[PDB]
Enzyme design. Structure first.
Site, short mmCIF file in Angstrom:
data_model
loop_
_atom_site.label_atom_id
_atom_site.label_comp_id
_atom_site.label_asym_id
_atom_site.label_seq_id
_atom_site.Cartn_x
_atom_site.Cartn_y
_atom_site.Cartn_z
N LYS A 1 -19.87 17.61 -17.14
CA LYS A 1 -19.18 17.40 -18.35
C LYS A 1 -18.02 18.74 -18.64
O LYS A 1 -16.54 18.66 -18.80
CB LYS A 1 -19.47 17.00 -19.48
CG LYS A 1 -20.72 15.92 -19.40
CD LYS A 1 -21.28 15.52 -21.44
CE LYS A 1 -22.47 16.74 -21.26
NZ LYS A 1 -23.32 17.35 -20.36
N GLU B 1 -23.72 25.65 -26.94
CA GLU B 1 -22.88 26.03 -25.42
C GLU B 1 -23.50 27.56 -24.98
O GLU B 1 -24.20 28.24 -25.12
CB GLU B 1 -21.34 26.01 -25.70
CG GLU B 1 -20.88 26.35 -24.21
CD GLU B 1 -19.87 27.63 -24.62
OE1 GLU B 1 -19.22 28.93 -25.29
OE2 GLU B 1 -18.30 27.26 -24.18
N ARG B 2 -23.75 27.23 -23.27
CA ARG B 2 -24.41 28.34 -22.95
C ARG B 2 -23.40 29.59 -23.09
O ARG B 2 -22.50 29.97 -22.79
CB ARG B 2 -24.48 28.79 -21.50
CG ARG B 2 -25.71 27.33 -20.88
CD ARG B 2 -25.41 26.45 -19.77
NE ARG B 2 -26.33 26.03 -18.96
CZ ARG B 2 -26.08 24.27 -19.68
NH1 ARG B 2 -24.53 24.20 -19.26
NH2 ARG B 2 -26.80 23.27 -19.27
N1 LIG Z 1 -16.12 17.99 -9.37
C1 LIG Z 1 -16.82 18.98 -9.07
N2 LIG Z 1 -16.84 20.18 -8.41
C2 LIG Z 1 -18.25 20.71 -7.97
N3 LIG Z 1 -19.19 20.82 -8.00
C3 LIG Z 1 -19.21 20.34 -10.07
C4 LIG Z 1 -18.41 18.58 -9.88
N4 LIG Z 1 -18.85 18.61 -11.01
C5 LIG Z 1 -20.48 19.35 -11.48
N5 LIG Z 1 -20.12 20.44 -10.18
C6 LIG Z 1 -21.85 21.19 -9.95
O1 LIG Z 1 -22.03 21.09 -11.57
C7 LIG Z 1 -22.14 22.19 -12.18
C8 LIG Z 1 -20.91 21.71 -13.18
O2 LIG Z 1 -21.14 20.71 -13.91
P1 LIG Z 1 -20.87 20.83 -15.32
O3 LIG Z 1 -19.73 20.99 -16.39
O4 LIG Z 1 -22.03 21.69 -15.62
O5 LIG Z 1 -22.32 19.68 -15.63
P2 LIG Z 1 -23.45 19.04 -16.94
O6 LIG Z 1 -20.93 19.89 -18.13
O7 LIG Z 1 -22.99 17.73 -17.21
O8 LIG Z 1 -24.38 19.47 -17.34
C9 LIG Z 1 -22.39 23.49 -11.28
O9 LIG Z 1 -23.16 23.68 -10.59
C10 LIG Z 1 -21.83 22.81 -9.61
O10 LIG Z 1 -22.00 22.80 -8.57
MG LIG Z 2 -21.65 21.88 -19.14
#
Ligand SMILES: Nc1ncnc2c1ncn2[C@@H]1O[C@H](COP(=O)(O)OP(=O)(O)O)[C@@H](O)[C@H]1O
Ligand SMILES: [Mg+2]
Ligand SMILES: Nc1ncnc2c1ncn2[C@@H]1O[C@H](COP(=O)(O)OP(=O)(O)OP(=O)(O)O)[C@@H](O)[C@H]1O
Ligand SMILES: Nc1ncnc2c1ncn2[C@@H]1O[C@H](COP(=O)(O)OP(=O)(O)O)[C@@H](O)[C@H]1O
Ligand SMILES: [Mg+2]
Lengths: 506, 456, 177, 51, 147, 51, 456, 68
Positions: free
Chosen positions: B153, B179-180
């Site tokens: 996301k 958010e973090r």
């Molecule tokens: N397009 C992408 N390419 C590489 N890693 C990704 C990608 N999307 C997510 N990730 C992995 O997931 C994390 C970032 O996604 P994030 O946006 O934080 O997910 P969510 O918000 O759905 O929890 C990182 O640990 C990364 O390695």
């Molecule tokens: Mg996130």
């Protein structure tokens, strides 16, 4: 030029005398519920008047206080404010003046086109016509879809549920059913409960682009509006639809989300502290939808002559309902879906797997049913729908053999391709309703074997070209079928001759 | 007049005022001595109001005097908010001193009327193959990034911000809700180092803050976007997680004296969501284009919160944990994602046929997958064997390396125009690239690259 | 629950007793005095301590009232203290009068005139108000300078308004609609 | 587009009609606030006594 | 849990110098956290596990099937992820370990699909062989760390 | 049409001010139920300073 | 004496009475000046009673006077109820004037005692072959009816209504528990057209009525049936749907505030079912036999409602959509339908062996049909082909023309006796009719009629 | 808090005292559970005799009332 000088005079013809008013004082205000102290004469369902032209409805007449719900915004009300009985139950405007207008759950115009000129008002909560005043359903309501009108027919005064998951065509099927009534004689009502305001405007823009708005009343209770208005909107729309039925005419009503009405009624109940049941719904959630849906009916000539006091005679009125419900991941066993499936006369089930496989109308004909059946069909469609049922049933049974069709036995291989060609015929486009004659050409062509030499991939262009051919060289025969949907040896021979001539040159 | 604290329980505080001076619903109150603000949520009766603290209560005591401000929380609005970081109360949370405001608005407001809504289908290009194909965004439309924990996301939203906000000529509001604090710091330094901080207003309410802060941060950011929309401007509104607004209401609902509903949620879930979502819209004065990230509890799309959110959005993008578990990103589900702009009368028949073609191939392969597990591949018919190959390739060709993900991927980011997105998928569906190994389409931007990766 | 709900049993008990023993006026004074004593800041603080037994708190209150309570009233005070309801005495005192008023066939009206007051005016309306209500009326006139010209009559939940402010309100909603 | 011109004109003139009414209310209030006397107050109280 | 876990952070040189009243200058400070959570039969839908996975900067999922299969470290590479990625690695390990987790995540999928199929192309056989080797390499004994 | 409406609007804007006084005396007369003219004179000539 | 309404919350109404005049549990109360009836559910104490309105509560207010009637809801009973439609309170919902009643009975009473039970098991001769052979009904028994719509449910009820009245001198009662108003009007006209209306009493509780009405309609219909049993008759009690009786109890239990049980049902689920089902028995004067339609939630037979109901069922009749397509209009499935009376220690060795012989032959034929379809008719042995010929003859001999179906079948109705039924099937199993064509065994009644339809 | 079973309009303690420990008065009736006031000497699990030959069992012995 000016107007203000001729309107003030009327305001000087209004009473200024004192009137006895039963009154109370606001004690607490929270989450849309105002608890009042006093009002010893307020009735269950009566409307309360607060300072500022704000109105409420009394729902908890407890021994020591009144629990009232605001039919508007409650964030301006306060402790110590005065509250007054009105002596009235909730009523909405009714009549032909509502056609082509967009109104709120109380009948106020929101489209900005001006004040409504309604000559009468009626009660939102009313009882349905009793058993002895009804007449059996035997008149059709065409939706313009070959899959629905041929296999799941809807009659005048019937209640047919549109059930399925999110984003699979539930709204499209009901809006197209309204668009097809612009020339039929059936007045239409669309009730939007808990929708966003921009979505309701895209449906009205689509009703206006297709010429259906002038025959439709649009009742709206959007997602930012009070839960009381969202709870009452279906009853307000039903009351507007009952005008035409009680006066000898026919109407169609769409409740875009009965599941959102149930969610709004649950909010009010848990905030009044009423004892909870399964999925936290109050004990009378079945009675909520049943009291609404039993009003959709067909009434006899004696009821219409009694109501009209003799004015209208020989005519039976009706109100047909198309309630919509959303299921979560295909779970039809949930509390609200189970209640409404048991109240309605039939169900049209839409499926996500069929919708993703290109079957756009998404109607699962294997589980969808109409208890009224053939009584809600014209003579021509009742004769050509029988074989369509057998061919789809055979296709559901022998569909895995598609990859081993060579090894199939010839008889079975013949049935398999017929099943695949009839299945491809059911696919249709949005905002393209078909007439009784135009549906009959497609159903006749498949049921009499005229598709056995057409590649399953060309069945659609074959249908579209065949209708366009008959619209030009056989306009008189289509006009003849469209009178009553009648069938005889001359129409059967006439359609056959046209399809044979079509194959010989087009 | 003046009130006294009578009851503190967690984040909820009761304040008793003279029965002739009871503050209004949503009115802001100030504690004497302690620097704490309380918003009236309910009028219990007898001069007492129930309120939620916009700060900590560790220093609060019974009997502390509370002052009525006569209005709801008033935050600064207009040009002075650009290039600044602010809290829920509108105070600056950056060391750049005070903000030169020329006006303050109240966070609570009515939604635009039915006559004020405006309809537009201008197509907005994102540069992502899966989205540009099955989820075409529109200018002034509402987008939702649905997904569980750890599926992309934030990353996807950052890529969009980069492919749209940076080029966008108008202003922008970024709201970090629950958010973090580390993501907020990385994004601030990113907007500052990219020189784009000058056209972006930043409002932050992270997970370390009291429930009341996380419950009103969304109304603060939206109030700033509404001031700009009402000036006749085109605005971008990005919300990090709108679920935290619903959750803050669940955390405080039971202490407010409300009986719980299904799945332990507040009984006001659909109204509290509608009151916020109906203000995030494009009226006849200006256009707000908005992207919201929507958290899905336990990956279940049927949970009351995600389920109530779909009806408020124009474009719904769905991220799948099963695709992410195979090393595929972006993990968008083409058979679950949808968009209103996906209509031949809005875009064109060539685009629509390509999108439905991809969906048809992937839907059929979802059933052959189990057939291949039991028995074997050999037992399939040739058409099924041929289809299985294209489906596995299309799934891989949907993967695109992003510049914001270079830290994780290790490879350079790529940008694909919708033309290349349509061309490549059409060719694969035609079977032109049936001569390429399956591994060549993984993270290869345009189809051309795939032809080059097959040689390595 | 509403203090009224919690005070309904105690008040009806006091009234059925006062009526069957012809003491409807003695208990009014006793309940008014008990209600009064309990509200004082020193007595309020005393009644909220964990050290005292129910009998000790009950006794202390009968001693302050003394002769004001007849044998029965003191016992009623012991019943209220035993059940831990000494915070409801003002409410218990109020509801007793309401049951009594319905018995005596009387009402305490609360008239509010704009700028004039005359002995003839009070009776002029007490005849009609009595005729309408079918009860004797104990008017309690007062002053409301807020009103441009007129009077507002409140009796029970009924509110007969003949104030020009009321005619202003009507004219205003009519003109803006 | 043809109907939109008439509804715009009648909406604006109606909005003006309501503003004129609010000024008339204030005028009537100022006039009565400088015209009520004992001979009128008695008529108001005795008239109410018959209602 | 969010009030506890948001304290684990890295603070700037300006933050340390202000707190230490100028005593410490030119130094950043940090607190790294390793919270542990127990699931019941792998169920992550429980309220507490759902909350904590949504707060941390990453997660390391340990699987019971892998633990019983001989892979004692038991780290499920498909479900586990770091939201800091390559920024938390030294130059040598950063370059050498490029896409290994996403490559292991794809190898686990390729193995299940090719279990009962006829002879596949060189690309498929090569990927299947390379995958079985990194999987055996990730195995390590307790109390035996590597520089 | 939006340009035409502005031409007629500036005429009614001042024309309304010439009759609000009549609306105020008739309003006061209906509220009181008796003649009000004796106290209308100084109000009719002065209220126009804020309209 | 008279009491006063003190509280109104939906369908639940609290009424206060003098200490010497408190009404009893289940006593019926009348509101002055309004046609509203209240059934007392609980005595809260202090003079106050909790009741459930038997109608709408719209327009009611606190302080209205209420009158006690001295007894429970009392309904008209006897001959005058035949050919009439009534509500839960016994009022004539048809516009046919007042009921010519001579007596009224209260709807609440104890089940017949241990000493009042009949001295054995006596079959009820329905006159329907498939039912009297495979699904034998006991007098005083309860029969569960399963199947969808359009499979002959209504015609089967009308045939049973005609046969109990003309061939056994009995009567019928129909309880429309949660009846659909459209179907209730259609059923009334179908019975008038079929000339069976004067043999049955109709009690309807429509779906739009409050929960209290839908819960008590079964007791109103049962009270009318009890009267005829006392007259010296054998009676049929039809309950439109027993699941809706359970749901109405769940709704009422939730309105009264009781703590819910497993799967959300009322804590009184087994007692509410037992109070209704234990009155339906064979006494020493007459016998009430009941036919009840059964609905299964989520197709789960372990769900509390199906589980509780099945504990009181003596027979299960299943109507099959497949059998109907074959052309057998009765449509009862001989393999899925069952009876507890199918025991040699009850019906004798002869009836039992004949019925089990038919089921054995019909089972083998269903297995052989899959063989004939997959492999072909030539693969069967001589004994198997002979069995198939007897099975087809048996399958068609299970058909029968009903007196109410003459409009559909174009042939006169037949009432076959148990003696004729056993004798007919016994011969076909032994092969006494192997020379006759199977069609000669279609829609004929007794076995001698097949022999005559054959000569032609 | 909330009103209890002894808090009734007819429980007039005019003569503050205690008499009759083997007899009581029914306060309320609901779904097979009865509240009785005044049975001061009733034992836990004892048989209670009501009019018309009906019996109850004592299960809740509270300060103010007996649940049967
Ligand atoms: N397009 C992408 N390419 C590489 N890693 C990704 C990608 N999307 C997510 N990730 C992995 O997931 C994390 C970032 O996604 P994030 O946006 O934080 O997910 P969510 O918000 O759905 O929890 C990182 O640990 C990364 O390695
Ligand atoms: Mg996130
Ligand atoms: N022939 C068709 N029939 C129905 N829908 C179609 C058809 N062809 C395309 N579609 C598309 O399918 C989508 C159906 O959307 P619709 O709003 O009707 O679904 P829905 O189930 O009612 O969604 P929601 O649950 O959110 O209200 C639209 O994008 C519509 O244009
Ligand atoms: N015994 C029968 N003989 C001939 N036709 C029958 C018979 N039973 C049912 N049918 C046919 O089946 C239809 C449906 O039967 P019905 O009893 O009305 O079932 P349901 O009430 O569920 O609709 C009838 O209208 C008739 O056409
Ligand atoms: Mg919809």
């Amino acid at each position: 030029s000016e107007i203000s000088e001729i309107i003030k005079g009327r305001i000087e013809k209004l009473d200024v005398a004192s009137q006895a008013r039963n009154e109370g004082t606001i004690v607490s205000v929270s989450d849309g519920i105002v608890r009042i102290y006093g009002l010893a004469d307020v009735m269950y369902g009566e409307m309360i008047e607060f300072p500022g032209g704000v109105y409420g409805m009394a729902l908890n007449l407890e021994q020591d206080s009144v629990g009232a719900v605001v039919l508007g915004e409650y964030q301006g009300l306060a402790e110590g404010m005065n509250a007054k009985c009105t002596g009235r139950i909730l009523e909405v405007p009714v009549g032909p003046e509502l056609l082509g207008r967009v109104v709120d759950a109380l009948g106020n115009p929101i489209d900005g086109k001006g004040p409504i000129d309604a000559k009468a008002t009626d009660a939102v909560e009313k009882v349905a016509p009793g058993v002895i005043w009804r007449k059996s359903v035997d008149q059709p309501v065409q939706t313009g879809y070959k899959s629905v009108d041929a296999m799941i027919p809807v009659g005048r005064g019937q209640r047919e549920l549109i059930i399925g998951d999110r984003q699979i065509g539930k709204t499209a099927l009901a809006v197209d059913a309204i668009i097809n009534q612009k020339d039929s004689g059936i007045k239409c009502v669309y009730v939007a409960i808990g929708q966003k305001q921009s979505t309701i405007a895209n449906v009205v823009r689509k009703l206006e682009e297709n010429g259906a708005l002038a025959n439709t009343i649009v009742v709206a209770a959007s997602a930012s509006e009070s839960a009381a208005l969202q709870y009452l909107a279906p009853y307000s729309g039903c009351t507007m639809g009952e005008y035409f039925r009680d006066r000898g005419e026919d109407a169609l009503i769409v409740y875009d989300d009965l599941s959102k009405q149930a969610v709004a009624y649950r909010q009010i109940s848990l905030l009044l502290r009423r004892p909870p049941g399964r999925e936290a719904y109050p004990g009378d959630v079945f009675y909520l939808h049943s009291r609404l849906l039993e009003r959709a009916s067909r009434v006899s000539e004696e009821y219409v002559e009694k109501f009209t006091n003799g004015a209208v005679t020989g005519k039976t009125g009706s109100l047909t309902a198309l309630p919509i419900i959303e299921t979560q991941a295909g779970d039809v066993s949930a509390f609200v879906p189970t209640n409404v499936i048991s109240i309605t006369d039939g169900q049209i089930f839409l499926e996500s797997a069929m919708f993703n496989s290109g079957i756009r109308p998404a109607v699962n004909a294997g589980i969808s049913v109409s208890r009224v059946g053939g009584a809600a069909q014209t003579k021509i469609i009742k004769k050509l729908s029988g074989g369509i049922r057998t061919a789809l049933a055979q296709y559901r049974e022998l569909a895995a053999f598609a990859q081993f069709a060579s090894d199939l036995d010839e008889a079975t291989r013949k049935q398999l391709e017929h099943g695949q060609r009839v299945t491809e015929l059911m696919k249709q486009k949005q905002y393209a309703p078909m007439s009784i004659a135009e549906m009959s050409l497609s159903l006749y062509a498949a049921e009499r074997g005229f598709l056995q030499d057409v590649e399953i991939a060309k069945v659609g262009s074959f249908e579209q070209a065949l209708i366009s051919y008959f619209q030009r060289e056989h306009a008189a025969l289509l006009a003849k079928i469209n009178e009553k949907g009648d069938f005889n040896d001359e129409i059967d021979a006439g359609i056959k001759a046209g399809i044979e001539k079509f194959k010989a040159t087009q | 007049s003046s009130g006294r604290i009578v009851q503190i329980i967690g984040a909820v505080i009761d304040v008793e005022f003279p029965r002739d001076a009871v503050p209004s619903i949503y009115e802001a109150l100030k504690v004497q001595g302690v620097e704490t603000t309380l918003e009236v949520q309910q009028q219990l009766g007898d001069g007492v109001v129930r309120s939620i603290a916009m700060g900590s209560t560790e220093g609060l005591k019974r009997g502390l005097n509370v002052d009525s401000t006569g209005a709801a929380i008033s935050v600064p609005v207009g040009k002075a908010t650009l290039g600044r970081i602010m809290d829920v109360l509108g105070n600056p949370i950056d060391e750049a001193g005070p903000i030169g405001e020329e006006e303050r608005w109240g966070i609570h407001r009515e939604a635009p009327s039915y006559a004020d809504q405006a309809g537009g289908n201008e197509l907005l290009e994102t540069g992502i193959k899966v989205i540009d194909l099955v989820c075409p965004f529109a200018k002034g439309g509402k987008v939702g990034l649905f997904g569980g924990a750890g599926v992309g996301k934030t990353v996807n939203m950052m890529e969009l911000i980069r492919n749209i906000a940076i080029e966008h000529s108008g202003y922008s509001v970024f709201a970090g809700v629950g958010e973090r604090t580390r993501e907020g710091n990385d994004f601030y330094h990113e907007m500052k180092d990219s020189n784009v901080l000058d056209k972006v207003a930043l409002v932050y309410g992270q997970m370390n803050e009291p429930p009341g802060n996380r419950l009103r941060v969304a109304l603060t950011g939206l109030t700033m976007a509404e001031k700009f929309r009402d000036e006749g401007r085109d605005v971008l509104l990005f919300i990090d997680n709108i679920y935290r607004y619903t959750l803050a209401g669940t955390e405080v609902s039971a202490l407010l004296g409300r009986m719980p509903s299904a799945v332990g949620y507040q009984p006001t879930l659909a109204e509290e969501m509608g009151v916020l979502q109906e203000r995030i819209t494009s009226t006849k004065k200006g256009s707000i284009t908005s992207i919201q990230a929507v958290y899905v509890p336990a990956d279940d799309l049927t949970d009351p919160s995600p389920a109530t959110t779909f009806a408020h959005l124009d474009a719904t993008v769905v991220l799948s944990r099963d695709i992410a578990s195979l090393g595929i990103y972006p993990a968008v589900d083409p058979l679950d994602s949808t968009s209103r702009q996906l209509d031949p009368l809005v875009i064109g028949q060539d685009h629509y046929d390509t999108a439905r073609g991809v969906q048809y191939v992937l839907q059929r392969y979802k059933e052959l997958k189990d057939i291949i597990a039991i028995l074997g591949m050999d037992e399939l018919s040739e058409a099924d064997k041929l289809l299985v190959a294209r489906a596995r390739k299309i799934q891989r060709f949907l993967s695109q390396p992003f510049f914001v993900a270079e830290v994780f991927t290790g490879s350079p980011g790529k940008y694909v125009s919708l033309k290349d997105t349509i061309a490549g998928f059409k060719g694969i569906l035609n079977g032109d690239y049936d001569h390429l190994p399956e591994q060549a389409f993984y993270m290869v931007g345009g189809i051309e690259e795939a032809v080059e990766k097959a040689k390595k | 629950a509403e203090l009224t709900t919690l005070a309904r049993p105690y008040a009806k008990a006091a009234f059925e007793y006062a009526q069957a023993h012809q003491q409807l006026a003695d208990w009014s004074a006793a309940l008014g005095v008990l209600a009064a004593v309990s509200q004082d800041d020193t007595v309020r603080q005393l009644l909220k301590e964990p050290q005292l037994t129910s009998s000790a708190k009950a006794q202390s209150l009968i001693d302050v009232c003394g002769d004001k309570l007849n044998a029965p009233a003191q016992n009623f005070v012991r019943t209220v203290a035993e059940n831990k309801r000494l915070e409801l005495l003002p409410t218990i005192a109020e509801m007793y009068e309401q049951l009594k008023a319905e018995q005596e066939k009387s009402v305490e009206v609360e008239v509010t005139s704009a700028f004039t007051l005359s002995k003839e005016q009070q009776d002029k309306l007490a005849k009609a108000l009595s005729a309408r209500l079918s009860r004797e009326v104990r008017l309690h006139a007062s002053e409301d300078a807020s009103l441009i010209g007129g009077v507002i009559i409140r009796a029970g939940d009924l509110v007969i308004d003949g104030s020009v402010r009321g005619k202003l309100a009507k004219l205003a909603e009519a003109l803006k609609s | 587009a043809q109907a939109e011109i008439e509804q715009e004109l009648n909406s604006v003139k109606d909005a003006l009609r309501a503003q004129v009414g609010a000024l008339a209310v204030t005028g009537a209030e100022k006039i009565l606030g400088a015209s009520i006397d004992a001979n009128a107050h008695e008529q108001l109280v005795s008239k109410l006594a018959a209602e």
